[PDB]
Write an enzyme that holds these catalytic residues in place. Structure first.
Site, PDB file in Angstrom:
ATOM      1  N   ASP A   1       0.839  -1.187   0.000  1.00 37.29           N
ATOM      2  CA  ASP A   1       0.000   0.000   0.000  1.00 37.29           C
ATOM      3  C   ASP A   1       0.885   1.251   0.000  1.00 37.29           C
TER       4      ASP A   1
ATOM      5  N   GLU B   1       1.853   4.980   2.126  1.00 36.99           N
ATOM      6  CA  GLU B   1       1.796   5.810   3.322  1.00 36.99           C
ATOM      7  C   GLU B   1       2.546   7.103   3.056  1.00 36.99           C
TER       8      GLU B   1
ATOM      9  N   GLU C   1       2.271  -8.604  32.856  1.00 39.08           N
ATOM     10  CA  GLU C   1       0.862  -8.883  32.599  1.00 39.08           C
ATOM     11  C   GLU C   1       0.687 -10.232  31.911  1.00 39.08           C
TER      12      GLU C   1
ATOM     13  N   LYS D   1      -1.187 -14.197  32.870  1.00 37.40           N
ATOM     14  CA  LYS D   1      -2.205 -14.837  32.044  1.00 37.40           C
ATOM     15  C   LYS D   1      -1.828 -16.267  31.672  1.00 37.40           C
TER      16      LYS D   1
HETATM   17  N1  LIG Z   1       1.796  10.979  12.957  1.00 34.95           N
HETATM   18  C1  LIG Z   1       2.519  11.501  14.105  1.00 34.95           C
HETATM   19  C2  LIG Z   1       1.842  11.138  15.283  1.00 34.95           C
HETATM   20  O1  LIG Z   1       1.104   9.793  15.061  1.00 34.95           O
HETATM   21  C3  LIG Z   1       0.195   9.374  16.151  1.00 34.95           C
HETATM   22  O2  LIG Z   1      -0.662   8.359  15.657  1.00 34.95           O
HETATM   23  C4  LIG Z   1      -0.035   7.187  15.489  1.00 34.95           C
HETATM   24  C5  LIG Z   1      -1.044   6.027  15.627  1.00 34.95           C
HETATM   25  O3  LIG Z   1      -2.098   6.368  16.613  1.00 34.95           O
HETATM   26  C6  LIG Z   1      -1.564   5.938  14.399  1.00 34.95           C
HETATM   27  O4  LIG Z   1      -2.116   4.702  14.162  1.00 34.95           O
HETATM   28  C7  LIG Z   1      -3.052   4.814  13.089  1.00 34.95           C
HETATM   29  C8  LIG Z   1      -4.473   4.705  13.667  1.00 34.95           C
HETATM   30  O5  LIG Z   1      -4.738   5.837  14.467  1.00 34.95           O
HETATM   31  C9  LIG Z   1      -5.552   4.624  12.577  1.00 34.95           C
HETATM   32  N2  LIG Z   1      -6.847   4.373  13.201  1.00 34.95           N
HETATM   33  C10 LIG Z   1      -5.255   3.507  11.573  1.00 34.95           C
HETATM   34  C11 LIG Z   1      -3.863   3.697  10.952  1.00 34.95           C
HETATM   35  N3  LIG Z   1      -3.592   2.594  10.026  1.00 34.95           N
HETATM   36  C12 LIG Z   1      -2.755   3.754  12.008  1.00 34.95           C
HETATM   37  O6  LIG Z   1      -1.553   4.091  11.309  1.00 34.95           O
HETATM   38  C13 LIG Z   1      -0.428   3.339  11.763  1.00 34.95           C
HETATM   39  O7  LIG Z   1      -0.762   1.894  11.887  1.00 34.95           O
HETATM   40  C14 LIG Z   1      -0.671   1.053  10.602  1.00 34.95           C
HETATM   41  C15 LIG Z   1      -0.631  -0.341  10.945  1.00 34.95           C
HETATM   42  N4  LIG Z   1      -2.016  -0.868  11.056  1.00 34.95           N
HETATM   43  C16 LIG Z   1       0.626   1.443   9.849  1.00 34.95           C
HETATM   44  O8  LIG Z   1       0.686   0.753   8.603  1.00 34.95           O
HETATM   45  P1  LIG Z   1       1.824  -0.134   8.010  1.00 34.95           P
HETATM   46  O9  LIG Z   1       1.632  -1.402   8.981  1.00 34.95           O
HETATM   47  O10 LIG Z   1       1.738  -0.640   6.591  1.00 34.95           O
HETATM   48  O11 LIG Z   1       3.351   0.298   8.300  1.00 34.95           O
HETATM   49  C17 LIG Z   1       4.055   1.183   7.426  1.00 34.95           C
HETATM   50  C18 LIG Z   1       5.313   1.688   8.125  1.00 34.95           C
HETATM   51  O12 LIG Z   1       4.943   2.313   9.356  1.00 34.95           O
HETATM   52  C19 LIG Z   1       5.700   1.794  10.451  1.00 34.95           C
HETATM   53  N5  LIG Z   1       4.783   0.978  11.285  1.00 34.95           N
HETATM   54  C20 LIG Z   1       4.652  -0.363  11.239  1.00 34.95           C
HETATM   55  N6  LIG Z   1       3.731  -0.803  12.131  1.00 34.95           N
HETATM   56  C21 LIG Z   1       3.256   0.277  12.778  1.00 34.95           C
HETATM   57  C22 LIG Z   1       2.261   0.526  13.846  1.00 34.95           C
HETATM   58  N7  LIG Z   1       1.575  -0.495  14.414  1.00 34.95           N
HETATM   59  N8  LIG Z   1       2.060   1.804  14.234  1.00 34.95           N
HETATM   60  C23 LIG Z   1       2.735   2.826  13.677  1.00 34.95           C
HETATM   61  N9  LIG Z   1       3.652   2.674  12.703  1.00 34.95           N
HETATM   62  C24 LIG Z   1       3.956   1.446  12.222  1.00 34.95           C
HETATM   63  C25 LIG Z   1       6.773   0.892   9.868  1.00 34.95           C
HETATM   64  O13 LIG Z   1       8.025   1.584   9.823  1.00 34.95           O
HETATM   65  C26 LIG Z   1       6.294   0.575   8.466  1.00 34.95           C
HETATM   66  O14 LIG Z   1       7.394   0.573   7.551  1.00 34.95           O
HETATM   67  C27 LIG Z   1       0.671   2.909   9.609  1.00 34.95           C
HETATM   68  O15 LIG Z   1       1.874   3.240   8.810  1.00 34.95           O
HETATM   69  C28 LIG Z   1       0.720   3.640  10.863  1.00 34.95           C
HETATM   70  N10 LIG Z   1       0.708   5.148  10.551  1.00 34.95           N
HETATM   71  O16 LIG Z   1      -0.289   6.190  13.386  1.00 34.95           O
HETATM   72  C29 LIG Z   1       0.500   7.037  13.990  1.00 34.95           C
HETATM   73  C30 LIG Z   1       1.950   6.514  13.989  1.00 34.95           C
HETATM   74  O17 LIG Z   1       2.394   6.356  12.645  1.00 34.95           O
HETATM   75  C31 LIG Z   1      -0.675  10.472  16.676  1.00 34.95           C
HETATM   76  N11 LIG Z   1      -1.862  10.649  15.723  1.00 34.95           N
HETATM   77  C32 LIG Z   1      -0.009  11.783  16.830  1.00 34.95           C
HETATM   78  O18 LIG Z   1       0.917  11.726  17.971  1.00 34.95           O
HETATM   79  C33 LIG Z   1       0.754  12.188  15.621  1.00 34.95           C
HETATM   80  O19 LIG Z   1      -0.143  12.291  14.516  1.00 34.95           O
HETATM   81  N1  LIG Z   2      -9.788   5.366  30.943  1.00 35.26           N
HETATM   82  C1  LIG Z   2     -10.606   6.185  30.061  1.00 35.26           C
HETATM   83  C2  LIG Z   2      -9.886   6.471  28.887  1.00 35.26           C
HETATM   84  O1  LIG Z   2      -8.746   5.436  28.712  1.00 35.26           O
HETATM   85  C3  LIG Z   2      -7.840   5.720  27.578  1.00 35.26           C
HETATM   86  O2  LIG Z   2      -6.727   4.851  27.654  1.00 35.26           O
HETATM   87  C4  LIG Z   2      -7.020   3.619  27.223  1.00 35.26           C
HETATM   88  C5  LIG Z   2      -5.743   2.934  26.698  1.00 35.26           C
HETATM   89  O3  LIG Z   2      -4.901   3.900  25.955  1.00 35.26           O
HETATM   90  C6  LIG Z   2      -5.149   2.562  27.835  1.00 35.26           C
HETATM   91  O4  LIG Z   2      -4.199   1.593  27.622  1.00 35.26           O
HETATM   92  C7  LIG Z   2      -3.292   1.567  28.725  1.00 35.26           C
HETATM   93  C8  LIG Z   2      -1.943   2.139  28.263  1.00 35.26           C
HETATM   94  O5  LIG Z   2      -2.098   3.502  27.933  1.00 35.26           O
HETATM   95  C9  LIG Z   2      -0.862   2.018  29.344  1.00 35.26           C
HETATM   96  N2  LIG Z   2       0.409   2.494  28.806  1.00 35.26           N
HETATM   97  C10 LIG Z   2      -0.701   0.568  29.805  1.00 35.26           C
HETATM   98  C11 LIG Z   2      -2.037  -0.004  30.305  1.00 35.26           C
HETATM   99  N3  LIG Z   2      -1.857  -1.420  30.637  1.00 35.26           N
HETATM  100  C12 LIG Z   2      -3.167   0.133  29.278  1.00 35.26           C
HETATM  101  O6  LIG Z   2      -4.376  -0.245  29.947  1.00 35.26           O
HETATM  102  C13 LIG Z   2      -5.256  -0.965  29.085  1.00 35.26           C
HETATM  103  O7  LIG Z   2      -4.545  -2.094  28.431  1.00 35.26           O
HETATM  104  C14 LIG Z   2      -4.348  -3.348  29.297  1.00 35.26           C
HETATM  105  C15 LIG Z   2      -3.971  -4.449  28.459  1.00 35.26           C
HETATM  106  N4  LIG Z   2      -2.832  -4.041  27.595  1.00 35.26           N
HETATM  107  C16 LIG Z   2      -5.684  -3.658  30.021  1.00 35.26           C
HETATM  108  O8  LIG Z   2      -5.498  -4.752  30.915  1.00 35.26           O
HETATM  109  P1  LIG Z   2      -6.038  -6.203  31.092  1.00 35.26           P
HETATM  110  O9  LIG Z   2      -5.603  -6.933  29.725  1.00 35.26           O
HETATM  111  O10 LIG Z   2      -5.732  -7.144  32.231  1.00 35.26           O
HETATM  112  O11 LIG Z   2      -7.639  -6.123  30.946  1.00 35.26           O
HETATM  113  C17 LIG Z   2      -8.465  -5.825  32.070  1.00 35.26           C
HETATM  114  C18 LIG Z   2      -9.858  -5.478  31.562  1.00 35.26           C
HETATM  115  O12 LIG Z   2      -9.765  -4.390  30.637  1.00 35.26           O
HETATM  116  C19 LIG Z   2     -10.429  -4.695  29.409  1.00 35.26           C
HETATM  117  N5  LIG Z   2      -9.379  -4.850  28.371  1.00 35.26           N
HETATM  118  C20 LIG Z   2      -8.837  -6.010  27.954  1.00 35.26           C
HETATM  119  N6  LIG Z   2      -7.901  -5.800  26.993  1.00 35.26           N
HETATM  120  C21 LIG Z   2      -7.834  -4.474  26.782  1.00 35.26           C
HETATM  121  C22 LIG Z   2      -7.054  -3.571  25.902  1.00 35.26           C
HETATM  122  N7  LIG Z   2      -6.136  -4.062  25.035  1.00 35.26           N
HETATM  123  N8  LIG Z   2      -7.291  -2.244  25.995  1.00 35.26           N
HETATM  124  C23 LIG Z   2      -8.200  -1.746  26.853  1.00 35.26           C
HETATM  125  N9  LIG Z   2      -8.943  -2.505  27.678  1.00 35.26           N
HETATM  126  C24 LIG Z   2      -8.811  -3.852  27.689  1.00 35.26           C
HETATM  127  C25 LIG Z   2     -11.155  -6.014  29.609  1.00 35.26           C
HETATM  128  O13 LIG Z   2     -12.543  -5.774  29.862  1.00 35.26           O
HETATM  129  C26 LIG Z   2     -10.506  -6.640  30.826  1.00 35.26           C
HETATM  130  O14 LIG Z   2     -11.491  -7.262  31.656  1.00 35.26           O
HETATM  131  C27 LIG Z   2      -6.159  -2.468  30.778  1.00 35.26           C
HETATM  132  O15 LIG Z   2      -7.384  -2.811  31.538  1.00 35.26           O
HETATM  133  C28 LIG Z   2      -6.452  -1.374  29.871  1.00 35.26           C
HETATM  134  N10 LIG Z   2      -6.955  -0.165  30.681  1.00 35.26           N
HETATM  135  O16 LIG Z   2      -6.388   1.981  28.756  1.00 35.26           O
HETATM  136  C29 LIG Z   2      -7.443   2.686  28.447  1.00 35.26           C
HETATM  137  C30 LIG Z   2      -8.611   1.767  28.036  1.00 35.26           C
HETATM  138  O17 LIG Z   2      -8.889   0.846  29.087  1.00 35.26           O
HETATM  139  C31 LIG Z   2      -7.324   7.123  27.570  1.00 35.26           C
HETATM  140  N11 LIG Z   2      -6.231   7.253  28.637  1.00 35.26           N
HETATM  141  C32 LIG Z   2      -8.353   8.153  27.819  1.00 35.26           C
HETATM  142  O18 LIG Z   2      -9.221   8.256  26.637  1.00 35.26           O
HETATM  143  C33 LIG Z   2      -9.203   7.858  29.003  1.00 35.26           C
HETATM  144  O19 LIG Z   2      -8.387   7.869  30.173  1.00 35.26           O
HETATM  145 MG    MG Z   3      -7.016  -8.243  35.472  1.00 40.05          MG
HETATM  146 MG    MG Z   4      -4.225  -6.015  33.860  1.00 35.19          MG
END
Ligand SMILES: NC[C@@H]1O[C@H](O[C@H]2[C@@H](O)[C@H](O[C@@H]3[C@@H](O)[C@H](N)C[C@H](N)[C@H]3O[C@H]3O[C@H](CN)[C@@H](OP(=O)(O)OC[C@H]4O[C@@H](n5cnc6c(N)ncnc65)[C@H](O)[C@@H]4O)[C@H](O)[C@H]3N)O[C@@H]2CO)[C@H](N)[C@@H](O)[C@@H]1O
Ligand SMILES: NC[C@@H]1O[C@H](O[C@H]2[C@@H](O)[C@H](O[C@@H]3[C@@H](O)[C@H](N)C[C@H](N)[C@H]3O[C@H]3O[C@H](CN)[C@@H](OP(=O)(O)OC[C@H]4O[C@@H](n5cnc6c(N)ncnc65)[C@H](O)[C@@H]4O)[C@H](O)[C@H]3N)O[C@@H]2CO)[C@H](N)[C@@H](O)[C@@H]1O
Ligand code: MG
Ligand code: MG
Ligand SMILES: NC[C@@H]1O[C@H](O[C@H]2[C@@H](O)[C@H](O[C@@H]3[C@@H](O)[C@H](N)C[C@H](N)[C@H]3O[C@H]3O[C@H](CN)[C@@H](OP(=O)(O)OC[C@H]4O[C@@H](n5cnc6c(N)ncnc65)[C@H](O)[C@@H]4O)[C@H](O)[C@H]3N)O[C@@H]2CO)[C@H](N)[C@@H](O)[C@@H]1O
Ligand code: MG
Ligand code: MG
Lengths: 252, 252
Positions: B49, B51, B144, B148
């Protein structure tokens, strides 16, 4: 080393110690204190951790304390009422995985029914938001993965195919969750609950069988299984009205 | 239906059509336009794709356009110079996965060398930020996961074990990437590049073999591989001084 075995009584003891420290530090700025996660559902296992949420009256408040003592782990979330209610009413691609936290809150402190209001907000989300989140998931996640496994088929590396297949199956479970407005109980049961639903896309149950069983070594079976699920997505979206706009070449 | 096969010349034709549309719409508010991802590295495959990133002069500007035509997919990010420079200098748990986008930007438009300045910012981040991100990764992700799979060992479900193992191996690659200040080339090569590094925690290469080969069906072998890798994490951080503070029972 790592999490130790704990009982539900020991975790609730820690929760009330944390509530007393939160009340001592912030006083009457605390609107509510609640327990979520497995402890808030009272289904915590021997090695489960603790997750708590706190609603503040201080506007724009958003911080979190997450730590370990070497034996156990705690996470406490602090949000203003508006920040928490806003987040509870936004539907992302991973909404079925994240927003279940609002449906089983164990009340510990609540000055003005804030924990109940959050529950009503997450449960009253209008249909259009799930429709838009499904269209976003197809473009931002599914269409992206389809290009990645089609590349792997012609140029590798097949060493990424098992990881990608887990991600494709997890994104499909989010699609089903958004369709039925279901939040999965916990991350460990996402796939198990997804395949039990109605209106599954064709080929999803077969793709899930590989991921749940751990048989991700036959690359050619996986690539054919992924392609069938992708075809099943096209029939599924037409069947359910989820039309992704493809008419414009540059939509801005 | 799905991503279509395209050549690098056809993708760059689409890029310059988008550049011409971006310059017409925002005029001299555009500071720079660049291509990242595989196309910016000139390693895009048949199904890759597109970017693009755009630096704006409009302060506090932050939005994105991501769409498909049914045949291909494009994502364009719009950020102010201060927002983009800030994000390029913050180190999260997935920094090795995300910030590689700043080390291989293909300049398409640049009014004042902004693309090089972003590269210098992401490339000059101080060591302490990686130190703090490593300590956070251990608590928020690795500790974490340990709870699990230890729960799964005593109460199931084993159908989550293959998915969990892929996530643990990916989190280990983030740890190694943060230690060596490495940004992985692409998501498909994260594990392949992680195991080739020096100073790996004990047991990580063995755990990676299950995920890269797709042999995730022997649940009891996976749990032993996870526990050995977890023990290797404690020894690795101790030899490396990365001490996660455990002295306080409630650290606020
Ligand atoms: N832009 C500056 C900065 O970015 C921040 O936002 C982050 C992050 O929140 C955001 O994620 C996007 C989502 O919000 C949106 N809903 C969907 C988009 N697709 C997301 O974009 C990012 O995630 C996809 C992966 N699903 C990346 O696509 P691709 O996998 O083909 O990778 C292309 C190149 O990019 C690098 N890369 C690889 N994996 C990742 C992931 N998981 N995250 C970020 N970059 C990745 C790698 O080098 C590869 O060659 C897509 O490129 C990516 N943009 O995206 C940005 C970070 O890029 C905040 N919005 C804000 O702080 C500010 O805008
Ligand atoms: N709180 C209101 C709202 O939350 C927003 O933030 C989001 C998200 O950004 C944030 O993620 C946390 C990270 O920012 C931080 N660096 C580390 C923390 N561990 C993150 O917390 C969330 O992710 C972990 C898992 N990676 C969750 O823990 P656990 O897997 O044991 O699950 C416990 C219960 O929570 C629900 N659940 C399960 N998986 C997930 C994931 N992947 N994301 C969110 N919730 C999950 C499920 O029901 C399960 O019983 C942890 O609970 C989770 N909090 O976390 C919050 C969303 O929860 C923004 N900060 C802002 O918009 C605002 O504060
Ligand atoms: Mg728990
Ligand atoms: Mg937990
Ligand atoms: N990207 C912009 C960048 O940063 C600044 O802009 C700020 C500002 O726009 C906003 O900050 C919030 C303020 O608007 C508000 N008035 C007070 C809030 N406290 C600010 O949020 C920020 O405050 C703390 C920092 N101590 C962060 O919480 P914390 O370090 O504990 O987070 C640890 C991890 O846990 C996750 N997290 C955080 N809160 C929650 C909750 N409630 N639930 C679940 N998870 C949570 C979090 O993701 C993190 O990984 C807080 O995260 C932080 N947002 O937002 C940005 C934040 O920097 C600059 N002004 C701007 O110039 C610069 O470009
Ligand atoms: Mg790409
Ligand atoms: Mg992409």
């Amino acid at each position: 080393n790592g999490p130790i075995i704990m009982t539900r009584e020991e975790r609730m003891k820690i929760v009330h110690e944390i509530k007393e420290r939160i009340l001592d530090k912030y006083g009457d700025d605390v609107k509510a204190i609640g327990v979520y996660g497995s402890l808030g559902r009272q289904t915590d296992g021997p090695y489960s951790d603790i997750e708590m949420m706190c609603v503040m009256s201080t506007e724009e408040a958003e911080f979190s304390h997450e730590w370990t003592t070497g034996e156990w782990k705690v996470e406490v979330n602090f949000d203003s009422e508006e920040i928490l209610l806003d987040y509870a009413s936004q539907v992302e691609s991973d909404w079925p995985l994240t927003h279940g936290q609002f449906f089983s809150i164990l009340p510990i402190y609540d000055s003005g029914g804030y924990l109940e209001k959050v529950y009503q907000t997450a449960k009253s989300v209008e249909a259009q938001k799930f429709h838009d989140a499904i269209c976003a998931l197809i473009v931002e996640e599914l269409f992206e993965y389809a290009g990645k496994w089609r590349n792997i088929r012609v140029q590798g590396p097949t060493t990424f195919l098992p990881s990608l297949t887990v991600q494709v199956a997890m994104a499909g479970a989010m699609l089903i969750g958004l369709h039925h407005r279901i939040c999965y109980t916990t991350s460990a049961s996402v796939l198990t609950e997804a395949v039990k639903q109605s209106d599954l896309p064709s080929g999803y149950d077969h793709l899930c069988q590989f991921v749940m069983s751990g048989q991700l070594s036959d690359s050619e079976k996986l690539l054919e299984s992924l392609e069938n699920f992708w075809n099943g997505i096209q029939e599924w979206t037409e069947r359910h009205g989820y039309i992704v706009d493809v008419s414009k070449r540059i939509p801005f």
